[PDB]
Amino acid sequence: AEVTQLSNGIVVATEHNPSAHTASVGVVFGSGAANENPYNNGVSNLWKNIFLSKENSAVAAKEGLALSSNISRDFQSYIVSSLPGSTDKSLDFLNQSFIQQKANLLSSSNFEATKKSVLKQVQDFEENDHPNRVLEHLHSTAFQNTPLSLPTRGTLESLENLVVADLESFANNHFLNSNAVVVGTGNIKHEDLVNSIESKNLSLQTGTKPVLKKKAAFLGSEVRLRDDTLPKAWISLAVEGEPVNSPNYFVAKLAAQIFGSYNAFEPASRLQGIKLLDNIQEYQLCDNFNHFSLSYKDSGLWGFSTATRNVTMIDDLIHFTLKQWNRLTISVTDTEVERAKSLLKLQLGQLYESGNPVNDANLLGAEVLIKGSKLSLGEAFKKIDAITVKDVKAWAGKRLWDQDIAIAGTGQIEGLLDYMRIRSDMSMMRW
Amino acid sequence: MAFRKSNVYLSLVNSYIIDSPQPSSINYWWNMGSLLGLCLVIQIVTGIFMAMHYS
Amino acid sequence: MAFRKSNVYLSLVNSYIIDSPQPSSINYWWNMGSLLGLCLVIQIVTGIFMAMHYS
Amino acid sequence: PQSFTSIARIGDYILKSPVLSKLCVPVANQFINLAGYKKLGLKFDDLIAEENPIMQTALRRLPEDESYARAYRIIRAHQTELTHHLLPRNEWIKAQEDVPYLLPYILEAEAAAKEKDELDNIEVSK
Amino acid sequence: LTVSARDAPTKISTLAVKVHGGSRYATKDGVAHLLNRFNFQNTNTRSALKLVRESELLGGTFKSTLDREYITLKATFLKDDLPYYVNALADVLYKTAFKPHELTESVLPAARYDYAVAEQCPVKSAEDQLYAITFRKGLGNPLLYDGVERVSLQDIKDFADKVYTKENLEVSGENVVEADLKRFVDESLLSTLPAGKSLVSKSEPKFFLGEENRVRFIGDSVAAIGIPVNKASLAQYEVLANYLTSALSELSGLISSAKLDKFTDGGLFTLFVRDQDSAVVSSNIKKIVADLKKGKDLSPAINYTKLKNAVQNESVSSPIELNFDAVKDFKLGKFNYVAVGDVSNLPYLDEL
Amino acid sequence: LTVSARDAPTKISTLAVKVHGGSRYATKDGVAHLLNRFNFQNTNTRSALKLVRESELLGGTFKSTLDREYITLKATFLKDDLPYYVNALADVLYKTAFKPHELTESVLPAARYDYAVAEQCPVKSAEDQLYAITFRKGLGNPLLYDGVERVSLQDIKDFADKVYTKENLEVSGENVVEADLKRFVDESLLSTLPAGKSLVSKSEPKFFLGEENRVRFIGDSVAAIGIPVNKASLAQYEVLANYLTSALSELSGLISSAKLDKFTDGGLFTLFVRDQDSAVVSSNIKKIVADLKKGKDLSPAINYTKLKNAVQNESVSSPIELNFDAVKDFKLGKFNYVAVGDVSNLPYLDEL
Ligand code: HEM
Ligand code: HEM
């Protein structure tokens, strides 16, 4: 299905899908925002946004190419998608303006306009988008003083000290042949992509990226960005979870799928088979929740996020969901595991098997970059079907039962109790 | 809601000794009230066990 | 608000014996409880005034 | 504490029998007449204890005019019992007027809650 | 009963029953919205809780979406569970219970939430004002129920058996075997549905030009222009919508958004300019109309919008099959205009 | 500083200071409403509590009214208490404190209450829509502050500095000696206000015809028409406004209300049809304009008009003094139209 080969310096990965009507090539590097200082934080955002400038994207639009890019913790990608007959126009564009001739992109009077719009973008992020900024603050307090603690968008105080020297320094240090996968999704075939990446003699750079002196360590902590002038209360709360290439990767995904997501205002979201709903529905404790299992290279996160307007009963919402977490160690049933198996297979099928080949390019690039190949969906389903109740109980006794947590909150979180009551909720006194 | 709030008596116990919001800055001179309550329990129990033998 | 509501102790007294909403249909068998309260006060007071002379 | 599906099950088995109905329904009619709730202007579905979630949903799903009539019959029974009298015999409930009006709502809410707990204790065959 | 499918060697199937029952066909205001929010409540043979808690164990979810033309009943599931989901959607279309306690507990609060979440966005306000002043009683119906004319439960039942007829629906399946889907849509309850009339009209929807509307609003202010498009000049306006938002145009930093809603009998081209202060919105919308009243060469954006049309026809599979090659020039003629927000400082149609 | 007074042998006097500072001259939307609600708050020398207590012990009341053209400061009192009320009005105009804690505690909730009770009447909603589509940014400014554009306290102080000038006010007393009033409005603080300029224009207010606006509303439905009137045709539209709501007409079973607002430089004739269902008000307004487009003779209603004009200009003794004798016929020309309520069942302007 996926095929992956290694050229003179570049690894190439394709997912050919002959019933698609767009093809999409690009390059996925292996250094997201986890490879920055607290002082050049926001360099990858500036590279994402100078790759998508108006004068860089006008050249792609005249040839019928649509640009896309993504900054994450581990990886970063730069994707050019077009019609199936014009894959080499895309490879030519990605070469001649991003890979080799990046001196017109890094023009001053282009850098200034892009830096100004990125500053405006993160300023409107930091004061209007409340669930995502507390997920970023959960990351920045769970992994503090380690490289995984950095926001992917950067920081308004960090971003206004950046110059073009920092962008080209990061480019020299990280945009390398040893760090990059060239991806192709859509109905581009593999032999045509390798034949046109050896037809042009495409070479990115020849160094090797710096290796970080400390690994990401989970520190049980809290942060409270309280603001009484906001309507709701947004609370994210997580334990240390599994990183990628765990053996407990799918067990963590399944254990997050057991408690699922919920929306108070959708009538078929109130009828789910979660036993948390018939504790939080009687007094309408929350508006929504979602249980996540975020996996990175070094470490991971496992927890939930809620937004609620019932600011008087936040502590009972937290108490009821953590007493529902305890059942994974003690008394999780057969049925909850089977239901979460079916829902997890559906969620992974909707994530991978989707029509958009930009998303397939991002997923294939990050997966092949971190473990050298890509696990198929049939093998993923055969690894999900093999999970038992004892695997969930063993994983929850390891990672959940009586462990330190990380909390982040904004809004009206006066009703949220301190660290120690919430942490003492993580293990019940066997009743 | 939690059973320590939903109950008649346990909400009194909760509201007075469990969830009761205290100022964080209070020092060890604010333990004298709990100390006087312990003293009163000591006096009452030992007084009953001596009045079982006092004439 | 009224002083019988805006107090600490008179709030309890008001809520239990003054503004307590009773069903209007209750017959004379719903006086046994206040009768047991009167009986308990009788027993406690007369017992104290006899324990002042009991050996 | 005996939920109405059980009562309706036993009652339908009695009423659908030729022998059991002709012996038991006269006894039940005399029981209803001796019970004397009708003399206070009450139908039997005003008598059911309402402080459980099943009857709270049934009373919430009852329509507006039925709820106003039920509230009036209840307030009239309280004022009548307050004076230790009865209602005048023209104001008594007749047998055709003593209709089961809350019973479909109670039966629907009870079937909903029974399906709810049977699907909470669901178990798969794998 | 047009049944069409499209196989794939993959894991997730997706069924959809699309009914010509949108706002354009609504009898009273918001009956399509209330029937849409009613869709997956309980049937006569299976409760709404039993449907959710069996679909979770079989591995799939149900959804139903409303727009101007369609009520779409979508079922996303694991590939070899198809007859369960065709019987689920057939039961939803044929026998749904229509209880007044369901109207007053689930459907009306869900619809009230939908209206209150769409009310805060001034672009949705401007878009429905634009639709209502362009088309008056067909497509210009209100999209969501807001209780200005009271919709009963009998109105919802009447709309349901008006639009849930055998000639007024399509069945479309991604990643479904077409022979087995056709065998499962008969031997079902889609064969017992009434063979009613197809509500789609092949006429032209009788547009109006030069109209203007101004709405007071607290927050962001939006200036919107709207142009009705016939079936012939549909692709010229699609090239224009993809040209104005791409980096080819100098107006892309002034335009908040621009799109072309397409139908089977034409469409509407809408353009929105939105921010938080009226001076910038007034300046920008004057620049947009002063540049569009002169010509725009749209021929650079043809391959770009060929790609964009392929992208947006991957998600849907409603193909309109547009030319894109005979598109050379655009010049703005007459247009309807909506000012939402601080309308004492937004310009009028005189000044544009 | 025009000072006029009309004596009487009567116990109760009243005294009005009228400034040209109403919603016609509002620099921001609703700064006149906030200045009006601000008027009798505390001044530098006397608190607002002390004014109310001392005036009650002396026996009178103050009031401040806002209409489109004026801000009126009225004081009703017992007759021989005149210089107290003169100095109180002079202090209110000259030296009001303009404290932020008075803006946020007593003035803004009062204005919020005013707007919240004026929203509930669909006739006032239709009337301001009518004013806004006939005159755009003159008299079409909104009467009441609704917070669509934010009015700070410095805006209220600037508007008061603009309109509380010596050339922009009229002192108008009833049951009061004119020599005493003229002695008390100098010997005062009204004679050391800034001698600015009078904001009233002698031009024509630049009307607009053929416009239409529809706003949805939950409740009663109102269809309204509105005709701008110049200065010389004022008497004819007043005879029409009194003819259409009297028993001489066939239409007052259908017409809910009809009036003519008269200003210095023209006016606006408004007509309102209001009901709880849309079919009645639709057929009514169709009948009204269909039989007003054919002519009407108004010479029956001239004496009735003289009577109603006398009883409605008995109150204020600055009226307009129309002639009424040369009016014979009326035929409806062009007019602006406003639908409020169930707007997808009310008729449009081209259907009238
Ligand atoms: C308020 C709390 C109490 C205080 C402060 C208190 C104080 C005292 C004191 C000072 C003594 C004298 C002890 C001595 O000097 O030898 C005493 C004696 C006594 N108290 Fe209390 N007491 C209290 C509560 C009680 C109670 C509740 C009882 C009975 C149940 C009780 C029963 C006795 C008895 C029987 C004695 C007898 C003499 C002795 O054994 O010391 N006390 N009390
Ligand atoms: C709950 C309420 C009470 C009840 C039911 C109760 C019951 C009794 C009874 C039945 C007797 C025996 C009477 C006899 O046959 O002579 C008695 C005796 C006695 N009770 Fe109580 N009693 C109560 C409260 C009290 C209290 C609070 C005291 C102490 C203050 C007290 C002090 C006595 C004494 C001293 C006697 C001694 C014998 C006598 O004098 O009759 N009682 N009690």
UniProtKB/Swiss-Prot annotation, chain A:
Q: Does the keyword Zinc apply?
A: no
Q: Which terms does the record give in the GO molecular function aspect?
A: metal ion binding; metalloendopeptidase activity
State the Gene Ontology BP annotations. Answer: aerobic respiration; cellular respiration; mitochondrial electron transport, ubiquinol to cytochrome c; protein processing involved in protein targeting to mitochondrion; proton transmembrane transport
Q: PANTHER family from the xrefs? A: CYTOCHROME B-C1 COMPLEX SUBUNIT 1, MITOCHONDRIAL, METALLOPROTEASE
- Asked whether the keyword Magnesium is assigned, the reply is no
Q: Which domain of life is it from?
A: Eukaryota
Q: What is this protein called?
A: Cytochrome b-c1 complex subunit 1, mitochondrial
What family name appears in the similarity comment?
Answer: Belongs to the peptidase M16 family. UQCRC1/QCR1 subfamily.
Species this protein is from: Saccharomyces cerevisiae (strain ATCC 204508 / S288c) (Baker's yeast)
Coiled-coil blocks: none
Where does it primarily localize?
A: mitochondrion
Name a GO CC annotation attached to this entry.
mitochondrial inner membrane
Curated annotation (Swiss-Prot), chains B, C:
Positions with a binding annotation for a ubiquinone: Y16
Where does it reside?
Mitochondrion inner membrane
Q: Which residues form a coiled coil?
A: none
Where are the Mitochondrial matrix topological domains?
Answer: 1-27
Which stretch is the leader sequence? none
Q: Which residues cross the membrane?
A: 28-51
Q: List the disulfide bonds.
A: none
Report the sequence similarity comment from the record.
Belongs to the cytochrome b family.
Q: Extra notes?
A: Heme 1 (or BL or b562) is low-potential and absorbs at about 562 nm, and heme 2 (or BH or b566) is high-potential and absorbs at about 566 nm.
> How the protein assembles, per its UniProt entry?
Component of the ubiquinol-cytochrome c oxidoreductase (cytochrome b-c1 complex, complex III, CIII), a multisubunit enzyme composed of 10 subunits. The complex is composed of 3 respiratory subunits cytochrome b (COB), cytochrome c1 (CYT1) and Rieske protein (RIP1), 2 core protein subunits COR1 and QCR2, and 5 low-molecular weight protein subunits QCR6, QCR7, QCR8, QCR9 and QCR10.
Record's function text: Component of the ubiquinol-cytochrome c oxidoreductase, a multisubunit transmembrane complex that is part of the mitochondrial electron transport chain which drives oxidative phosphorylation.
Protein name (Swiss-Prot/TrEMBL):
Cytochrome b
What species is this protein from? Saccharomyces cerevisiae (strain ATCC 204508 / S288c)
Q: What is the lineage of its organism?
A: Eukaryota, Fungi, Dikarya, Ascomycota, Saccharomycotina
Swiss-Prot record, chain D:
Which keywords, in A-to-Z order, does the entry hold? Electron transport, Membrane, Mitochondrion, Mitochondrion inner membrane, Respiratory chain, Transport
Q: Where in the cell is it found?
A: Mitochondrion inner membrane
Q: What Gene3D superfamilies does the database record attribute to this sequence?
A: Cytochrome b-c1 complex subunit 7
Looking up Pfam families in the UniProt record yields: UCR_14kD
PANTHER family, alphabetically? CYTOCHROME B-C1 COMPLEX SUBUNIT 7, UBIQUINOL-CYTOCHROME C REDUCTASE COMPLEX 14 KD PROTEIN
UniProt miscellaneous comment:
Present with 10100 molecules/cell in log phase SD medium.
Q: What role is this protein assigned?
A: Component of the ubiquinol-cytochrome c oxidoreductase, a multisubunit transmembrane complex that is part of the mitochondrial electron transport chain which drives oxidative phosphorylation.
Q: What is this protein called?
A: Cytochrome b-c1 complex subunit 7, mitochondrial
Q: Which organism is the protein's source? A: Saccharomyces cerevisiae (strain ATCC 204508 / S288c) (Baker's yeast)
- This chain is encoded by the gene named QCR7
Swiss-Prot record, chains E, F:
Mind telling me which GO cellular component terms the entry cites? mitochondrial crista; mitochondrial inner membrane; mitochondrion; respiratory chain complex III
Q: What SUPFAM superfamilies does the database record attribute to this sequence? A: LuxS/MPP-like metallohydrolase
Superkingdom, taxonomy of origin: Eukaryota
Where found? Mitochondrion inner membrane
Q: How does it sit in the membrane?
A: Peripheral membrane protein
Q: Which Gene3D superfamilies match?
A: Metalloenzyme, LuxS/M16 peptidase-like
Extract the GO molecular function terms from the UniProt entry: metal ion binding; metalloendopeptidase activity
Q: Where is the signal peptide?
A: none
According to the UniProt entry, which residues carry Phosphoserine? S125, S152
What is annotated about its quaternary structure and interactions? Component of the ubiquinol-cytochrome c oxidoreductase (cytochrome b-c1 complex, complex III, CIII), a multisubunit enzyme composed of 10 subunits. The complex is composed of 3 respiratory subunits cytochrome b (COB), cytochrome c1 (CYT1) and Rieske protein (RIP1), 2 core protein subunits COR1 and QCR2, and 5 low-molecular weight protein subunits QCR6, QCR7, QCR8, QCR9 and QCR10.
The function of this protein is:
Component of the ubiquinol-cytochrome c oxidoreductase, a multisubunit transmembrane complex that is part of the mitochondrial electron transport chain which drives oxidative phosphorylation.
Q: Which family does it belong to?
A: Belongs to the peptidase M16 family. UQCRC2/QCR2 subfamily.
Q: What else is known?
A: Present with 35700 molecules/cell in log phase SD medium.
Question: By what name is this protein known?
Answer: Cytochrome b-c1 complex subunit 2, mitochondrial
